């Protein structure tokens, strides 16, 4: 049964006209002095708590004059409006009163607009904020995303003040959860301090209850001496209690101790012939090989970046549009390093190909990337904004490059091309001259490694390495990769083990491809044998895959089942 | 907060329901009460104001409907059945709409029944399914159907409201129903209609 939409909307607008001038209104909303005068039937359409306000034969139901409490003026004016023309104007500070008074109204469909609004907002600065909220309001699934979200930025910062009042049973779901992200158990155990600490002896009975969620390795050192320091003056029923206490509860490590310095692939050569290409992982220490989540439908042509924080973002990429058939989309996405998925977040202004997604104070910066523009400024450079999540233009480029690289050193942007090199200065956005290379090579990767740029190969690639100093500001030669000859090695410079290695992949005349990894000196100009990737764990990848640093979990992610 | 606030917040709430309870509904101002019963469910009990609900209708209910049905067995027994049922049936609606609302995140949480089908289940566990209001109802309804059969006009409407009554009281299709009416009256027209197939064929032939 299909509806007529025409009359639908001259319905709606004839609706919208008639409370804007105030004609049928038999019920009005006394809030703290504001007449609302409105219908009791369009309040239908839109709550589903005046059912009990007015279908039901109390007082209220007679009343024609309701004094209604523990509300806002503005949130009920917005949902009356919604109810009545359909404008939503969800802004950045009201939604949690909007929350509250959907709540207390009971309207699903607010409820359902502003629960997906606050799932897309979730972030740093509000993650613990918005764990309370959940908690407050029974909102499981953004309950759930919160959880997860507030454990990792938690772990990461850890510092934030509405932490310390926080309900006990949040706290105990919080701290004795397998998804936090640490690098040590001691930072988990000083925070639980700190918010016991916070308090009066009000935290003495939740503290029987938030060391019953660590681990015992911190149960009988340090931290226990303290605690009886802030004990109770002659409360003897909680150090002895503690005393032959930490006994159960059964020692184990926990997962954020498992992320290892990993290279990470996008675009490999699919295994099965179904699928266009896939991503993978090699493994330095577990010498394996883990597979990755597909790239969002199938993204290809994108380019990866890591924040020192350690997150994955992809930006730009092209779609096979529904034989040569791909179409640009400018779609943003996040990997979750623990549920093996890629989040959507906000898409960007312009679609790219190929862009150089570079991370800087905290902003993704995708330098060009074959816009759709194509006008006078054919750069369109444009960072990232991790706390507002939004898009921000930034100073153009001052000359056009085409297959280019970019890299951070020293606070600045290096964007390198065949033969030109400028650096972008944050603080003032300007670009700035640097130095000339001797050499026309592209088609290359770069690696910043200290306050060094390290350019490997460039044009198949070859093996020739320019290095150039940021305090010196000049490209000088180290030396040459030695490669077997009449070979076409896939260069890949990366950063790995506080030192500067390389993934180059040669191929021989009639045989296939050989994958091995080399150590570059520093000091002695030289590349060394650092380890042989054996082809029985790795096979061929392609030739339009890329490479990146990173740390992830062997837990989380599945050995990929595949022949040698 | 403290249990003395909780404590007189329960015990206004409860002085409510019983002022309600005893015909003094519609002319009663609850909002404040409701928002404090909210309070409630929200301090550490999350199902503190379901569980005051679920006793105090089961209380009443056996304090009034069930010593009214069982005083009234034999004169106007359906009548003042049906009556008790409809009173009962607009507390419903009015506590039923606001409890129900509430029964909006004990669906999504608490996957409980909504507070009218509680006070269904209740109804029909204190007054319909008891020990000797059943009984006594089957066999006056298998009575007063028999005389209806036998010949001689009664009324009619009452068994609808009846049926109807007992409909609603299944809350969730003909299962309660439809045992409970056909069984007995199954049996019945069975044996009446076979004793009325061996007459007939004796005193009459097949023209």
Same mark, same amino acid.
């Given at each position: 049964?299909?509806?007529?939409?025409?009359?639908?909307?001259?319905?709606?607008?004839?609706?919208?006209?008639?409370?804007? $001038?105030?004609?049928?209104?038999?019920?009005?909303?006394?809030?703290?002095?504001?007449?609302?005068?409105?219908?009791?039937?369009?309040?239908?359409?839109?709550?589903?708590?005046?059912?009990?306000?007015?279908?039901?034969?109390?007082?209220?139901?007679?009343?024609?004059?309701?004094?209604?409490?523990?509300?806002?003026?503005?949130?009920?004016?917005?949902?009356?409006?919604?109810?009545?023309?359909?404008?939503?104007?969800?802004?950045?500070?009201?939604?949690?009163?909007?929350?509250?008074?959907?709540?207390?109204?009971?309207?699903?469909?607010?409820?359902?607009?502003?629960?997906?609004?606050? &799932?897309?907002?979730?972030?740093?600065?509000?993650?613990?904020?918005?764990?309370?909220?959940?908690?407050?309001?029974?909102?499981?699934?953004?309950?759930?995303?919160?959880?997860?979200?507030?454990?990792?930025?938690?772990?990461?910062?850890?510092?934030?003040?509405?932490?310390?009042?926080? /309900?006990?049973?949040?706290?105990?779901?919080?701290?004795?959860?397998?998804?936090?992200?640490?690098?040590?158990?001691?930072?988990?155990?000083?925070?639980?301090?700190?918010?016991?600490?916070?308090?009066?002896?009000?935290?003495?009975?939740?503290?029987?209850?938030?060391?019953?969620?660590?681990?015992?390795?911190?149960?009988?050192?340090?931290?226990?001496?303290?605690?009886?320091?802030?004990?109770?003056?002659?409360?003897?029923?909680?150090?002895? $209690?503690?005393?032959?206490?930490?006994?159960?509860?059964?020692?184990?490590?926990?997962?954020?101790?498992?992320?290892?310095?990993?290279?990470?692939?996008?675009?490999?050569?699919?295994?099965?012939?179904?699928?266009?290409?896939? /991503?993978?992982?090699?493994?330095?220490?577990?010498?394996?090989?883990?597979?990755?989540?597909?790239?969002?439908?199938?993204?290809?042509?994108?380019?990866?970046?890591?924040?020192?924080?350690?997150?994955?973002?992809?930006?730009?990429?092209?779609?096979?549009?529904? $034989?040569?058939?791909?179409?640009?989309?400018?779609?943003?996405?996040?990997?979750?390093?623990?549920?093996?998925?890629?989040?959507?977040?906000?898409?960007?202004?312009?679609?790219?190909?190929?862009?150089?997604?570079?991370?800087?104070?905290?902003?993704?910066?995708?330098?060009?990337?074959?816009?759709?523009?194509?006008?006078?400024?054919?750069?369109?450079?444009?960072?990232?904004?991790?706390?507002?999540?939004?898009?921000?233009?930034?100073?153009?480029?001052?000359?056009?490059?085409?297959?280019?690289?970019?890299?951070?050193?020293?606070?600045? &942007?290096?964007?390198?091309?065949?033969?030109?090199?400028?650096?972008?200065?944050?603080?003032?956005?300007?670009?700035?001259?640097?130095?000339?290379? $001797?050499?026309?090579?592209?088609?290359?990767?770069?690696?910043?490694?200290?306050?060094?740029?390290?350019?490997?190969?460039?044009?198949?690639?070859?093996?020739?390495?320019?290095?150039?100093?940021?305090?010196?500001?000049?490209?000088?030669?180290?030396?040459?990769?030695?490669?077997?000859?009449?070979?076409?090695?896939?260069?890949?410079?990366?950063?790995?083990?506080?030192?500067?290695?390389?993934?180059?992949?040669?191929?021989?005349?009639?045989?296939?491809?050989?994958?091995?990894?080399?150590?570059?000196?520093?000091?002695?100009?030289?590349?060394?044998?650092?380890?042989?990737?054996?082809?029985?764990?790795?096979?061929?990848?392609?030739?339009?895959?890329?490479?990146?640093?990173?740390?992830?979990?062997?837990?989380?992610?599945?050995?990929?089942?595949?022949?040698? | 907060?403290?249990?003395?606030?909780?404590?007189?917040?329960? *015990?206004?709430?409860?002085?409510?329901?019983?002022?309600?309870?005893?015909?003094?509904?519609?002319?009663? !101002?609850?909002?404040?009460?409701?928002?404090?019963?909210?309070?409630?469910? @929200?301090?550490?009990?999350?199902?503190? @104001?379901?569980?005051?609900?679920?006793?105090?209708?089961?209380?009443?209910?056996?304090?009034?409907?069930?010593?009214?049905?069982?005083? !009234?067995?034999?004169?106007?027994? @359906?009548?003042?059945?049906?009556?008790?049922?409809?009173?009962?049936?607009?507390?419903?609606?009015?506590?039923?709409?606001?409890?129900?609302?509430?029964?909006?995140?004990?669906?999504?949480?608490?996957?409980?029944?909504?507070?009218?089908? @509680?006070?269904?289940?209740?109804?029909?566990?204190?007054?319909?399914?008891?020990?000797?209001?059943?009984?006594?109802?089957?066999?006056?309804?298998?009575?007063?159907?028999?005389?209806?059969?036998?010949?001689?006009?009664?009324?009619?409407?009452?068994?609808?409201?009846?049926?109807?009554?007992?409909?609603?009281?299944?809350?969730?299709?003909? !299962?309660?129903?439809?045992? *409970?009416?056909?069984?007995?009256?199954?049996?019945?027209?069975?044996?009446?209609?076979?004793?009325?197939?061996?007459?007939?064929?004796?005193?009459?032939?097949?023209?």
């Amino acid at each position: 049964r299909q509806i007529n939409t025409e009359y639908a909307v001259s319905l709606l607008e004839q609706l919208k006209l008639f409370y804007e $001038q105030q004609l049928f209104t038999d019920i009005v909303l006394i809030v703290e002095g504001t007449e609302f005068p409105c219908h009791k039937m369009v309040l239908a359409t839109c709550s589903s708590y005046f059912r009990a306000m007015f279908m039901s034969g109390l007082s209220e139901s007679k009343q024609t004059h309701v004094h209604l409490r523990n509300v806002d003026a503005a949130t009920l004016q917005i949902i009356i409006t919604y109810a009545y023309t359909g404008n939503l104007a969800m802004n950045d500070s009201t939604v949690e009163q909007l929350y509250e008074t959907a709540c207390f109204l009971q309207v699903e469909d607010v409820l359902q607009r502003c629960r997906e609004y606050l &799932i897309k907002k979730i972030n740093a600065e509000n993650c613990v904020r918005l764990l309370s909220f959940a908690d407050l309001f029974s909102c499981e699934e953004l309950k759930q995303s919160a959880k997860r979200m507030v454990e990792h930025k938690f772990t990461a910062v850890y510092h934030q003040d509405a932490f310390m009042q926080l /309900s006990h049973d949040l706290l105990i779901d919080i701290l004795s959860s397998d998804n936090l992200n640490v690098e040590k158990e001691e930072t988990v155990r000083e925070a639980a301090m700190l918010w016991l600490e916070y308090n009066t002896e009000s935290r003495s009975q939740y503290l029987s209850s938030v060391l019953s969620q660590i681990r015992i390795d911190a149960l009988s050192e340090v931290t226990q001496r303290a605690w009886f320091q802030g004990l109770p003056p002659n409360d003897k029923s909680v150090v002895v $209690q503690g005393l032959y206490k930490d006994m159960p509860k059964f020692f184990k490590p926990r997962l954020g101790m498992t992320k290892e310095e990993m290279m990470i692939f996008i675009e490999a050569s699919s295994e099965n012939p179904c699928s266009l290409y896939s /991503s993978v992982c090699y493994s330095p220490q577990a010498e394996k090989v883990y597979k990755l989540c597909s790239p969002p439908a199938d993204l290809h042509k994108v380019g990866t970046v890591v924040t020192p924080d350690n997150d994955i973002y992809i930006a730009g990429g092209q779609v096979p549009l529904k $034989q040569t058939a791909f179409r640009t989309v400018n779609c943003f996405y996040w990997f979750d390093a623990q549920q093996n998925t890629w989040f959507p977040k906000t898409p960007m202004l312009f679609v790219r190909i190929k862009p150089s997604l570079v991370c800087c104070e905290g902003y993704i910066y995708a330098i060009g990337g074959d816009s759709v523009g194509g006008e006078l400024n054919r750069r369109t450079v444009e960072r990232y904004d991790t706390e507002k999540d939004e898009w921000t233009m930034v100073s153009p480029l001052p000359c056009a490059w085409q297959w280019s690289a970019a890299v951070v050193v020293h606070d600045c &942007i290096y964007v390198m091309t065949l033969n030109l090199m400028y650096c972008y200065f944050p603080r003032s956005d300007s670009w700035v001259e640097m130095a000339m290379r $001797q050499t026309s090579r592209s088609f290359a990767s770069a690696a910043a490694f200290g306050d060094k740029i390290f350019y490997i190969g460039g044009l198949g690639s070859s093996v020739t390495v320019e290095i150039y100093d940021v305090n010196k500001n000049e490209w000088k030669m180290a030396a040459n990769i030695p490669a077997k000859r009449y070979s076409d090695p896939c260069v890949r410079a990366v950063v790995i083990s506080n030192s500067l290695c390389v993934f180059m992949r040669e191929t021989h005349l009639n045989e296939r491809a050989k994958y091995v990894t080399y150590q570059y000196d520093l000091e002695l100009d030289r590349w060394s044998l650092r380890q042989h990737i054996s082809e029985r764990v790795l096979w061929d990848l392609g030739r339009d895959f890329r490479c990146t640093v990173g740390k992830l979990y062997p837990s989380c992610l599945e050995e990929s089942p595949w022949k040698p | 907060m403290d249990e003395k606030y909780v404590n007189s917040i329960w *015990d206004l709430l409860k002085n409510a329901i019983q002022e309600i309870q005893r015909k003094n509904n519609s002319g009663l !101002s609850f909002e404040e009460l409701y928002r404090n019963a909210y309070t409630m469910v @929200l301090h550490k009990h999350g199902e503190k @104001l379901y569980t005051g609900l679920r006793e105090v209708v089961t209380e009443h209910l056996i304090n009034k409907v069930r010593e009214d049905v069982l005083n !009234s067995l034999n004169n106007n027994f @359906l009548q003042t059945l049906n009556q008790a049922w409809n009173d009962h049936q607009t507390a419903m609606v009015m506590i039923r709409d606001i409890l129900m609302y509430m029964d909006r995140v004990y669906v999504q949480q608490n996957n409980v029944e909504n507070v009218y089908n @509680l006070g269904l289940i209740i109804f029909r566990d204190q007054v319909v399914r008891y020990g000797c209001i059943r009984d006594h109802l089957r066999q006056t309804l298998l009575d007063m159907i028999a005389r209806e059969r036998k010949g001689e006009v009664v009324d009619r409407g009452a068994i609808r409201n009846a049926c109807q009554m007992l409909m609603i009281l299944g809350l969730e299709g003909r !299962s309660v129903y439809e045992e *409970d009416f056909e069984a007995p009256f199954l049996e019945m027209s069975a044996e009446f209609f076979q004793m009325e197939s061996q007459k007939f064929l004796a005193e009459n032939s097949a023209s």
